[PDB]
Design a binder for this molecule. Structure first.
Ligand SMILES: *[C@@H]1O[C@H](CO)[C@@H](O)[C@H](O)[C@H]1NC(C)=O
Lengths: 60, 49, 342, 367, 49
């Protein structure tokens, strides 16, 4: 879908290299994600994936 | 300078303006008009087809 | 409304790092010297004296600009529109048009073509502003050439136009005593003051009894001038005078006239209709107004009507359905005082 | 759905004016006012997250407030918002506080603690609630009329608006450096401590263990925690992590604005009489309410004021009537009639004062 | 080009305009085709021939 770029690969903002729960596996790479991928609106869907309760930690 | 001039309304004529700033180095500058865009009132009245 | 935005500023302990001269609307930057960063465990940096602090500040749009904003418009020539109800022989029918001589409509054999707006005056100047329920005819500063603390404290063409001409002069200061913050200077705006003192909207400033109406804004109901209407009607309405009665020996008798705005007097028409029939009554002057228009008449008797004028004595003539009556009325001083209708 | 917790970041707070003159290290401080609702509801930034926790529940007994590298918690019944009057809190959601309250020189918020001792961040804050319409109020309204207006819509779905949330400067804690006979045992205690020492053999660097910094004292050591695990925000008024540019802040911030109407008070109808080419209007008051009037010709000549009391006001009327707008009621419209009487005809002339009714005293020079 | 839009580029400041001759090549009642405009009294609405 919408193309998020962590300066290396043109991945979807729905499919990061760490789908799901980025902070639950890496704090500071999630912070670099919060520095870089904020130019994409579909990153909010990643924020619905990583941040806004769609982790591995939910029993869904 | 605060050099306010009136250049003739001609596209593509190099106007050579003079800046003899007071007790300073003289400086001739070029200007060139490139478009004159005039856009009237956008008031659509009705149609016909 | 704008929004003043700062970064989290740079606490360069043990040295100085010069900022980057970026281009932001009212970009502002200063690296204060000898600063004192403080936190929960006393001072923040173990380095104390050579602590400098870069500070930056800028102003951009706010989040109220989606639906809450005023707009300096350039007004132009006005387009007219009119509403008309005709009681078409006991039948009310209504139609709207342009009141310019230029809007012909036809329905129920009524070729309604108006005449021109005899006036030409518009209640608006080009320099107009509008906010959300009202308009105001004042001269705003134009785009780019705005003034801080006024209209034009912040200027944008459209809400989607991101050219925000800003004028704040938010000059920073050294903080109080080791306080980890950035103070800035004075910057009054326009939204903070003139919305509270725009005052009398153009609804209230209207001459001749104009009224304003938004969505889209429009000047209604200052009926000034004189409007013509040409109306063509076929012979489906007119009936022969032999289908009418020839009214003879008419004599008008006014028991009480009073030159007033309302019902100016009452009259009795002694008439001799030859038969039964519906016929017209129309005074030969415009000043006195019979409230009765089309009367059914029966024979050789006295009909009773009213009339209305401000003539001190209404002496006039009425075509009673192709017959003539001359009428006379000593009118009296008006005893009424206030009237709600013109 | 329903999480904000992990985009937060642990840049701390010392409230620079928490009342009675001076400052204190307080995380619950006030930063921003949003007053742009037309009706007068108030939208307030705090450095806390309310309605939500560490583990993101809708409980009202815990709230993340930062007390010296600790996430502590507090009851949401102890929300003492007060400008001059104690405010009427309506909306408690994360970054945002919504309340309707009158005029005041200052504004403060009050909060309980994990030690259960309530305090207050108290800044001198001259918020002035605005005016709208023409009407004020004495009692509470349950019977009123219409006015269009705008207020903050209560929606969680306001995306692409942010505040600045960033990696911390540090958390310098001078309670971590215990001294062992002229040395320093930096008791890190499951943290990540950056030391800055003016001594030998260990000056500036990171540590995870209770490190031995010999020939060094408390004034010679530093213990600054590089926080990257527990994350709780502030405003960007406090400084940055000063090793690079900025950690970019990304949190969508809810509760936008939209247009509504309101049960505005009405305006009481006044009483009037006519008199000789003029009008005589007694006004029942209710409160200080504006009034306007105009005439219906080449100029309106509109005059405007606020009236306050039982006010008998006299206005002369032109030939074109008078338009007086009082309250947001009907704009009252009037037209003159020739007033009483001139005369009879009689033995004298006695039409001059007929003519002082009909075109009164105008074009009487000509005869 | 009307004397309202100031512009600075590499600190060089210019307010341009306004236009001296305000001549207009357009009528009020003008009709528009996909690439063109013509000065012609189109018949008014409801009152067309
Ligand atoms: C028709 O119109 C006249 C004035 O135009 C009005 O007085 C009357 O009440 C109307 N009657 C109906 C039935 O609409």
């Amino acid at each position: 879908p919408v193309m998020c770029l962590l300066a290396n690969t043109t991945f979807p903002c729905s499919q990061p290299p760490c789908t799901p729960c980025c902070y639950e596996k890496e704090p500071e790479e999630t912070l670099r994600m919060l520095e870089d991928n904020v130019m994409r609106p579909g990153y909010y869907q990643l924020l619905q994936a990583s941040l806004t309760c769609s982790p591995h930690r939910q029993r869904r | 300078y605060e050099h306010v001039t009136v250049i003739p309304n001609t596209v593509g004529v190099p106007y050579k303006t003079l800046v003899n700033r007071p007790g300073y180095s003289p400086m001739v500058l070029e200007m060139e008009l490139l478009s004159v865009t005039l856009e009237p009132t956008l008031s659509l009245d009705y149609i016909t087809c | 409304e704008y929004k003043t935005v700062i970064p989290s500023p740079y606490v360069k302990c043990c040295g100085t790092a010069e900022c980057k001269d970026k281009s932001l609307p009212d970009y502002s930057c200063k690296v204060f010297t000898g600063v004192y960063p403080f936190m929960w465990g006393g001072a923040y940096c173990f380095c104390d004296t050579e602590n400098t602090q870069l500070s930056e500040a800028h102003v951009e749009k706010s989040e109220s600009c989606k639906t809450e904003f005023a707009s300096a418009y350039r007004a132009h020539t006005a387009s007219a529109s009119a509403k008309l109800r005709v009681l078409y022989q006991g039948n009310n029918v209504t139609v709207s048009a342009y009141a310019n001589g230029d809007h012909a409509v036809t329905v129920k054999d009524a070729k309604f073509i108006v005449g021109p707006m005899s006036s030409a005056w518009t209640p608006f100047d080009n320099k107009i502003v509008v906010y959300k329920g009202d308009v105001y005819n004042m001269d705003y500063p134009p785009f780019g050439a705005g003034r801080p603390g006024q209209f034009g404290d912040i200027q944008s063409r459209t809400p989607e136009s991101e050219d925000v001409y800003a004028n704040t002069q938010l000059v920073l200061q050294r903080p109080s005593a080791g306080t980890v913050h950035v103070p800035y200077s004075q910057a009054p705006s326009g939204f903070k003051y003139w919305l509270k003192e725009r005052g009398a909207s153009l609804q209230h400033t209207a001459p001749f009894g104009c009224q304003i109406a938004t969505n889209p804004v429009r000047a209604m109901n200052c009926a000034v001038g004189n409007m013509p209407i040409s109306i063509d009607i076929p012979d489906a309405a007119f009936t022969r005078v032999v289908d009418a009665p020839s009214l003879t020996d008419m004599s008008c008798e006014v028991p009480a006239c009073t030159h007033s705005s309302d019902f100016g007097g009452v009259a009795i028409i002694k008439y001799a209709a030859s038969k039964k029939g519906k016929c017209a009554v129309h005074s030969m002057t415009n000043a006195v107004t019979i409230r009765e228009a089309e009367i059914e008449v029966e024979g050789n008797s006295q009909l009773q009507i009213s009339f209305s004028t401000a003539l001190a004595s209404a002496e006039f003539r009425v075509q009673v359905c192709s017959t003539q009556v001359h009428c006379a009325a000593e009118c009296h001083p008006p005893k009424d005082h206030i009237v709600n209708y013109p | 759905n329903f999480n904000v917790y992990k985009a937060i970041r642990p840049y701390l707070a010392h409230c620079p004016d928490c009342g009675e003159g001076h400052s204190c290290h307080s995380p619950v401080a006030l930063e921003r006012i949003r007053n742009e609702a037309t009706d007068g509801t108030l939208k307030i930034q705090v450095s806390l997250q309310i309605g939500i926790k560490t583990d993101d529940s809708h409980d009202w007994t815990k709230l993340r407030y930062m007390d010296n590298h600790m996430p502590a918690d507090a009851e949401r019944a102890r929300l003492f918002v007060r400008t001059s009057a104690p405010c009427t809190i309506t909306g408690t959601m994360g970054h945002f506080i919504l309340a309707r309250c009158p005029k005041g020189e200052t504004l403060t918020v009050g909060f309980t603690d994990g030690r259960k001792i309530s305090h207050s961040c108290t800044h001198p804050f001259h918020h002035d609630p605005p005016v709208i319409g023409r009407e004020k109020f004495h009692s509470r309204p349950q019977h009123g009329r219409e006015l269009p207006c705008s207020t903050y819509a209560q929606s969680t779905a306001a995306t692409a608006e942010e505040i600045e949330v960033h990696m911390p400067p540090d958390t310098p804690d001078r309670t971590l450096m215990s001294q062992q006979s002229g040395n320093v045992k930096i008791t890190v205690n499951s943290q990540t401590v950056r030391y800055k020492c003016n001594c030998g053999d260990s000056n500036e660097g990171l540590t995870t263990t209770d490190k031995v910094i010999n020939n060094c004292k408390v004034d010679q050591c530093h213990a600054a925690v590089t926080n990257h695990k527990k994350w709780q925000y502030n405003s960007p008024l406090v400084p940055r992590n000063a090793e690079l540019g900025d950690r970019k802040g990304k949190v969508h911030i809810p509760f936008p604005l939209a247009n509504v109407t309101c049960r505005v008070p009405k305006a009481r109808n006044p009483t009037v009489t006519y008199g000789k080419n003029q009008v005589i209007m007694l006004l029942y008051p209710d409160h200080p309410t504006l009034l306007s009037y105009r005439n219906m010709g080449e100029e309106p000549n509109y005059q405007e004021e606020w009236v306050t009391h039982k006010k008998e006001i006299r206005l002369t009327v032109p030939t074109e009537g008078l338009e007086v707008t009082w309250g947001n009621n009907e704009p009252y419209k009037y037209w003159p009639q020739l007033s009483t009487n001139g005369t009879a005809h009689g033995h004298p002339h006695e039409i001059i004062l007929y003519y002082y009714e009909l075109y009164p005293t105008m074009t009487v020079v000509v005869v």
